[PDB]
Write a protein that binds this DNA or RNA. Structure first.
Lengths: 62, 91, 98, 135, 248
RNA sequence: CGCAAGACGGACCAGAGCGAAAGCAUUUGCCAAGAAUGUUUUCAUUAAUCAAGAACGAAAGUCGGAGGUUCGAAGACGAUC
RNA sequence: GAAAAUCCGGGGGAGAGGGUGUAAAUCUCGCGCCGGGCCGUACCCAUAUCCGCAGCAGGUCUCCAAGGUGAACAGCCUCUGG
RNA sequence: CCGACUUAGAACUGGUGCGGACCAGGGGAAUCCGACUGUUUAAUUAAAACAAAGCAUCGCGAAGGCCCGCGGCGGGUGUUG
RNA sequence: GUUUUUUCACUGACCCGGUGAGGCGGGGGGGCGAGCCGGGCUCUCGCUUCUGGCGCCAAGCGCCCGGCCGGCCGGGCGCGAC
C-alpha cells in the first residue's frame, strides 16, 4: 500500500515519495511483517540474555 | 438429493477406464481434493497445490506432504521411529 | 492432571470472568487484570514469546494448554478455536490455586 | 502488575518511528474522549548517535553523538513494552499532550527530549536504550 | 539396415530432456568447515514443484560463513518439512527430519534420503519421491557404513557422507492409475521424448530385430546376451530368469 | 562361532480368568473401556424382550501395498497299489 | 505454465557539509536551456501483384465486424463498403 | 411513479394450415472386431492396423545400465538416482 | 642371495568427486570426566537447536611516529584471528 502500481522503467520518472512509504523497510516490506520483526528482533535478543545469565550461574557450584 | 448410487468424484469419467480403475482412482481423488486442518493455525485450509506440496490458505505456510494425502502412512512411522532413535542417541 | 484442567476451565466459563482471544487478552495483561494466561500448543511462536514477556512484566502465571486451539476452544465450551485465553477472575474455581 | 509506567523504555511498533526505543512520560491507561483507546505520550530517539571509537578526534566524537528526538502519542498496541527503564526527568510542562496543538511547543518538547537524551548517552548509563534495534 | 530407435536415443537432438522450466539441480549443500566440525542453520524459504520430477524441492537459504552474502540451496524436500522451518546440517546436527548430518554419526535403523554415494558429491541415492534408505551397521575400522538402498541392495558407504533424515516428499504417486493416454502424454512432455511406445513386433524387419512376419510374432527368444551389439540388444537384456515372478 | 530375515510366544497353562460373541498368553510404556464387589452417594421407573434398521463376526476366499522364515491347497516327482 | 536486458524500493552507515551565515554540502520538487544519429516506411496481401510454368476453382499467418429472423459468429434477406 | 424481458392459461379464428422458407438425428432386434478419445499409408487401403491406460517380464546402486561418436579426461539419458 | 608368485597397505603416476580450490595434517595453549599427596602425567571437547529478526567493510588493547604552543590537533604497525 502507498506505492504506485506502474510498469518498472516508469519508476525513474516518479518522485521518491510515490515509490515508498515513510517507515523502516518502507515500500519494500508490509507493516504486519515489520512489527512482527521488531518483536522477533527484541524477544530473540531478550531470550539470549536469560540464556547468558543461566550460563554463568550453572558455573558457580562446580 | 443423492445423485449417484456408488460413483462419487469419479462420475466425471462416465463409463470410461473400467469400474475397478474408477473405484481405485475414487479413494485417491477424494483425498487429494479434500481440505485438511492446518496443524499450524487449525483452519481447514491445507489444500494440495501440486504433488507432495500442501498449502494452508490462511497461514500461507507450505508443507512437503504425500502425492494424494497430507501425511503418508510411511512418513508418520518414520517421524515416530526417527524421534525414538533421537531419544536413544541423546540418552 | 489434564482431565482436571478441562473441568477447572468449565467452572471458570460458568462462574468466572475471562477473555478469549489474543488482542483482547493482551489488553487485560497490560491493565494488570489477567491472573492466568492459557496458550494452545499451536499458537505462533512469536505470540507465545509475546504473551510470556507481557506476563513477565505483569507478573501473571502462563499455563501452556496440552492441545491446539480447536481443542482449547472446546475446553472453553466454544464452537470456535482460541490460541490465547486470559482469566480475569476465577469466580468460584480452583485454576489459579493449583 | 500494571507495568506501562512513566519510566518504561518501549519499542515503537508501528508508524514512521517503527523499531525506535521511546521513554513513556505519561500513560492514559483508560483513554479520554479525544482518544478512547488506552494510549501513552512517549519521547523517543529517531536518529540514534553513531558508533564512536577511541583515537577519533573530540570534535568528531561530538558530531557522531547527536540524538534527534521525537515526541508522540501511541496506542498501547502500537508500542512494545520492555523491562528496561530510563530514569530521565522530561518535565510534565514542556513535554505534554498540550504540545501537538501548537507546532512551536512541539519543537521545544523535541528539543527538551534531545538535550536530556544526549546528556545520559555520554554518562554510559541506559546504553541499551541508545543502541538501535537491529531488525 | 535402418538404425533402431534406441541407437537414435543416444544422439540426443529429439530424445534430450525437457529442462526449460526445470527449477535448477536438486543438490545437497556443499561440504565446508561448518558441515565437518559442527552444524550450519538455514531457513526453508518455500517447498516448490519441479517439472518432470515427482518429489517437491525445498529452497533452503543458509548464510555464507565467510562473506556477508546469503546462500540459497535446492534440497529434495523430506516428507513433513515445511516453510519457516530451520534446517540444520553438519557432524554436530540433531537427528530429526529434513536435517542433513553424516551417516556415520546417526544410529542403525535410521531412515535417510538424498544420500551421497561417494563423500562430497552433494546427494545421489534415494532422492526420488517417497523413497528412503536405512543405515544398517557401522565400521569405525575403515570408517564404513552398510546402507540398504530402495532397490533392496545393501551397499557399503564411507561414513563421512551425508543424507537428509526421513523419506522424500510426493510419496505414493505410483498408487494412482493414470486413467488416460493424455495424462501419460502430459507426464512425459515435462521429461523427454520417450512416451508413445511402439512395440518392435508392430514395426517392419528393417527398423527392429522383432519386426516383419505375416503374423505379429518375435520368432527368436526375447531374452538376449549382455555382449550383444547395439541394434540387436532388444527384448529382455541378459535375463537371469523370466515369466510370472513366483516366490520372493 | 558369528550374521541376516520372517514367523511363533513352549514349559509355567489349570475343566483357571477375561470378552457380546468371534476370540484373547514374552517385557515395559501409553490410550480409552469393563464386570464384580463396597456404598446410610445420586436420579426416581428411566425397565424387560424385541419386526424394520445397525455394530462386530474364526478359518478359508477376494481386492490393492509391503513381505515371504516355516508350513503348504494346486502343481511336479518318488513310493504303495 | 520462460529467461535476460532494464528499472526501482529497502537494510546498513564508510563518509560529506557549515559554525549562526552573502549559511554549507545536498535535493527523485517546480520551472528554464540544449540534443536525439543510422536503417525500413509506396503498393498488392489475393477467384489478377505471393507459391503452384499462367490473371490456375489449389495453397498461404492475422486484426475490425451493422439490422431482421433465430439458441446462434447457423442459414436466409437487408444497410455501410464493394 | 419508472418499468424490461419472459412464462403459463383462455377466447376466437383460417380450405387441418402453422419448426409453412431456412435450419434440422430414420429407427429397432442381433452377430463379428477393436474397450473408449486419439493416430495412420500427402496422391487408390481410416481399418479389425498403430497408440493407449491397465498388466507383466527384463537390465542397472553410477568405475553403472541403455545408447551415441573417426577421435578424446568426448557425448545423450542426466538440472537424472 | 637371485628370481617367480599369492596376500596385506603404501602413494607418487593414473582416475573420480567437490569447491569462489576457505580452516588440511601435526604441535602448542585453554575446558570437563579419570588418577597419586602447590607439582605433573594416560586421555577428552572446542563457543550457534525453543521463534519465518540482525550479522561484512573491527571494537578493544599494545606498539611506533608527523605542527602549534610538557598539555590541546592525525596516520602506520602488531595482537585480536596461535
Amino acid at each position: 500500500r502507498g506505492v504506485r502500481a506502474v510498469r518498472p522503467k516508469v519508476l525513474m520518472r516518479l518522485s521518491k515519495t510515490k515509490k515508498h512509504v515513510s517507515r523502516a523497510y518502507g515500500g519494500s516490506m508490509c507493516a504486519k511483517c515489520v512489527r512482527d520483526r521488531i518483536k522477533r528482533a527484541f524477544l530473540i535478543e531478550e531470550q539470549k540474555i536469560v540464556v547468558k545469565v543461566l550460563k554463568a550461574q550453572a558455573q558457580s557450584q562446580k | 438429493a443423492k445423485r449417484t448410487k456408488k460413483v462419487g468424484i469419479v462420475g466425471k469419467y462416465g463409463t470410461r477406464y473400467g469400474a475397478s480403475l474408477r473405484k481405485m482412482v475414487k479413494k485417491i481423488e477424494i483425498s487429494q481434493h479434500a481440505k485438511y486442518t492446518c496443524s499450524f493455525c487449525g483452519k481447514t485450509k491445507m489444500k494440495r497445490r501440486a504433488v507432495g506440496i500442501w498449502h494452508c490458505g490462511s497461514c500461507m505456510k507450505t508443507v512437503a506432504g504425500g502425492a494424494w494425502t497430507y501425511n503418508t502412512t510411511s512418513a508418520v512411522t518414520v517421524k515416530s521411529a526417527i524421534r525414538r532413535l533421537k531419544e536413544l542417541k541423546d540418552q | 492432571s489434564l482431565e482436571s484442567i478441562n473441568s477447572r476451565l468449565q467452572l471458570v466459563m460458568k462462574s468466572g470472568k475471562y477473555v478469549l482471544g489474543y488482542k483482547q487478552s493482551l489488553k487485560m495483561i497490560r491493565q494488570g487484570k489477567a491472573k492466568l494466561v492459557i496458550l494452545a500448543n499451536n499458537c505462533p511462536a512469536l505470540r507465545k514469546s509475546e504473551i510470556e514477556y507481557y506476563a513477565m512484566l505483569a507478573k501473571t502465571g502462563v499455563h501452556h494448554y496440552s492441545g491446539n486451539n480447536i481443542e482449547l476452544g472446546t475446553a472453553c465450551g466454544k464452537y470456535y478455536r482460541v490460541c490465547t485465553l486470559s482469566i480475569i477472575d476465577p469466580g468460584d474455581s480452583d485454576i489459579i490455586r493449583s | 502488575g500494571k507495568f506501562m509506567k512513566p519510566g518504561k523504555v518501549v519499542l515503537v511498533l508501528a508508524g514512521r518511528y517503527s523499531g525506535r526505543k521511546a521513554v513513556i512520560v505519561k500513560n492514559i491507561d483508560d483513554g479520554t474522549s479525544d482518544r478512547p483507546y488506552s494510549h501513552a505520550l512517549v519521547a523517543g530517539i529517531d536518529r540514534y548517535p553513531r558508533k564512536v571509537t577511541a583515537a577519533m578526534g573530540k570534535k568528531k566524537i561530538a558530531k557522531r553523538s547527536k540524538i534527534k528526538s521525537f515526541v508522540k502519542v501511541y496506542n498501547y498496541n502500537h508500542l512494545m513494552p520492555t523491562r528496561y527503564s530510563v530514569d530521565i526527568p522530561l518535565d510534565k510542562t514542556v513535554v505534554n499532550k498540550d504540545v501537538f496543538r501548537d507546532p512551536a511547543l512541539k519543537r521545544k518538547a523535541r528539543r527538551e527530549a534531545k538535550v536530556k537524551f544526549e546528556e545520559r548517552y555520554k554518562t554510559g548509563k541506559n546504553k541499551w536504550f541508545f543502541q538501535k534495534l537491529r531488525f | 539396415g535402418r538404425v533402431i530407435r534406441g541407437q537414435r536415443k543416444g544422439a540426443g537432438s529429439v530424445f534430450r530432456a525437457h529442462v526449460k522450466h526445470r527449477k535448477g539441480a536438486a543438490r545437497l549443500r556443499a561440504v565446508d568447515f561448518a558441515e565437518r566440525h559442527g552444524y550450519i542453520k538455514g531457513i526453508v524459504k518455500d517447498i516448490i514443484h519441479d517439472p518432470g520430477r515427482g518429489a517437491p524441492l525445498a529452497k533452503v537459504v543458509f548464510r555464507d560463513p565467510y562473506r556477508f552474502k546469503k546462500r540459497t540451496e535446492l534440497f529434495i524436500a523430506a516428507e513433513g518439512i515445511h516453510t519457516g522451518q530451520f534446517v540444520y546440517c553438519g557432524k554436530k546436527a540433531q537427528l530429526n527430519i529434513g536435517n542433513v548430518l553424516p551417516v556415520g554419526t546417526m544410529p542403525e535403523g535410521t531412515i535417510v534420503c538424498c544420500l551421497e554415494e561417494k563423500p562430497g558429491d552433494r546427494g545421489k541415492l534415494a532422492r526420488a519421491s517417497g523413497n528412503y534408505a536405512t543405515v544398517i551397521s557401522h565400521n569405525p575400522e575403515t570408517k564404513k557404513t552398510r546402507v540398504k538402498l530402495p532397490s533392496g541392495s545393501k551397499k557399503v558407504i564411507s561414513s563421512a557422507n551425508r543424507a537428509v533424515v526421513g523419506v522424500v516428499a510426493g510419496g505414493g504417486r505410483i498408487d494412482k492409475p493414470i486413467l488416460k493416454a493424455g495424462r501419460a502424454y502430459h507426464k512425459y512432455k515435462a521429461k523427454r521424448n520417450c512416451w508413445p511406445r511402439v512395440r518392435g513386433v508392430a514395426m517392419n524387419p528393417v527398423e527392429h530385430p522383432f519386426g516383419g512376419g505375416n503374423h505379429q510374432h518375435i520368432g527368436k527368444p526375447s531374452t538376449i546376451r549382455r555382449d550383444a551389439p547395439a541394434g540387436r540388444k532388444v527384448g529382455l537384456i541378459a535375463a537371469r530368469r523370466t515369466g510370472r515372478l513366483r516366490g520372493t
